[model samples]
Target chain A: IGTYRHVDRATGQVLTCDKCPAGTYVSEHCTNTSLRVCSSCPVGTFTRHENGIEKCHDCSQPCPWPMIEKLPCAALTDRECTCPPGMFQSNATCAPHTVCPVGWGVRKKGTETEDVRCKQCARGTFSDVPSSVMKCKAYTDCLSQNLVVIKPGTKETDNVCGTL
Target chain B: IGTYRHVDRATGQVLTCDKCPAGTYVSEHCTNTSLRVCSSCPVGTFTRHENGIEKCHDCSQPCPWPMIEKLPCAALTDRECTCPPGMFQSNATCAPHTVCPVGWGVRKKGTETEDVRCKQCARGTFSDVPSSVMKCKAYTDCLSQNLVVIKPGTKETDNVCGTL
Candidate 1:
């Protein structure tokens, strides 16, 4: 191979051929008759080494299932994969992130890699999907503890209190 | 030979192998010792023939920039690509469907492969903005044809004619 040192017969001097550059591979080794020949790697393959490598490695496989390709493979790099928005990896595969149902609020929003975490609405608070915050609201405390409950306390809305 | 004709000496008969079916390729030819081995074409390759093709051909390459993939390639099919919504291919590349700037309306709606054609507002017809429609409206002529333009003709508003 061109990678090894060779001595010139006439000058008595040793010399080594240059290695192939990144993104290319050595197609032919240098010999007494000819010099080393390098060729660009075909699409979907690359070689990061400059040391007379004969072949380039294939690019990473495409992302599977719910996971999408975040970055495409390049001549000198590999592809990257991640879950899509509103989804995350639960086990071996990506799954639809959970959306907290009624009577519950989101404890933590879902991320590209994690599912949405939820928790039950705390006592003394009610949520009826009113506004922002998206969480339960504080109850009126039975009109300063003077009024009696006209309606039972539920997770839907604050208890209706009236004059006794 | 592993593939070809298999003869059973005990049975006193010969069993001939069949050619590979469509959508599959013959990885190994029929032999005296082994049966023909047919391989289903992989995801990005296809072979529509039922002959003994040694390998399947690769699917078509992905479309260029601006054009989105319409249909994915299957085992026996080729990938499809076309212009994105609100855009059409004019010559070589995809371009945004033309939106008549002003005083003009779309003479023809742009299709997925064709560009939006526009036309100018005629003398009697007037068009002001006319967002979607490229057609202009007929202007109101002074009752007796004896009047002066109080307001000049413009794309936004119709001509305003009044007594001299």
Candidate 2:
């Protein structure tokens, strides 16, 4: 059947026929008295390429749960899915951006495509709470203000500076 | 036929036959000379209730991407999916908690089950950065410190005070 690209056997004769263009399908094959007839593909279906097929293909499924639409289905294309805001693609599913835990800070903000990156509060830096956007802050250097640390600093608390 | 719940016609006589139990299917209906033949549903398929059907229903499709496993598929149950950490159910999909934008702050921390709640920084309070956990801070009062205002506070910045 495929050997004859644009030809179809109708009635008692095998005559050369024209293929339907993208977004359309052949409604009737060519005959001795009539030419090939085509019809536009109905909504939600597509043919993609020129063919003599009688029916169009169904569009890909709609965006699944937790995912948003990226591209809509069209006569010649399928629908596409994307991660929702603040989410990123993880394999075939969308996932939420990571949140920095206590004592850590966000080094880079997460976007719809990537997870948030985090950095631990270093010895001279501090972060007292969990966050998804704040960066670690350098402890106030007492020396800069002619002061001394009145209270010690910890990963979860900042130092308190006071005049000596 | 379904009309006869546990009765089947065999050869020349109608007899009462035991229906296959849950998770199994009837491979062969009762016949005049043979009893019903039942077989356990193969892996990935299940029959939650007693049935005399020839095939088992495919277990609910495995948890789609981005969702973690909440329950595994069993002979009598389908698999279940749950939103991954940092995501919450929204309608039929999982979504990331909202991140408070600049000039706003988190009023309630987002959890695995809820989106983060946000509030605009009101008068006398400010939040200069986007965050998912930080709250607005009160503007420093110059009067309490015998200081003068170098700059007024805005939703996005704290007041700047200097010695009078």
Per-model TM-score on C-alpha atoms: 0.32, 0.32
Expressed as tens digits, the lDDT of each residue in B49-127 for candidate 2 is 6666789788777676777653345444455567765677887788987879889998887765788899999899999
Q: List residue ranges in candidate 2 displaced over 4 A.
A: A1-7, A11-13, A32-35, A89-93, A100-114, A120-164, B1-164
Compose the digit string of candidate 1's lDDT tens values, residues B64-120.
Answer: 877765433433335567786667888888887777766787778777788777788
The runs of at least 3 residues in candidate 1 whose Cα sits more than 4 Å from the true structure, single-residue gaps closed, are A1-164, B1-22, B28-37, B48-51, B90-92, B121-164
Which 10-residue window of candidate 2 chain B scores lowest in summed lDDT? Answer: B1-10
Question: lDDT of all predictions, in order shown?
Answer: 0.62, 0.69
Q: lDDT tens string, model 1, A1-164?
A: 12546564656656565566554566765554345556555567755455566787898888887676543453333556777656777778878777666666667767767777767778877677632125666777776889878887677678888885
lDDT of 2 by residue, A31-148 (tens): 6434455565666776656677888899888778987644345444455566765677788788877878878988888766788899888898888777776788888898896889
Residue A133 alpha-carbon offset, candidate 1, angstroms: 83
Task: Give the interface RMSD of candidate 2.
Answer: 26.7
The DockQ assigned to candidate 1 is 0.01
Clashing pairs in 1: B2-B34, B3-B30, B3-B31, B4-B30, B4-B31, B105-B134, B106-B134, B128-B155, B128-B156
Error of 2 at B52 (Å): 56
- Per-residue error (Å), model 2, residue B158: 99
Clashes of each: 9, 2
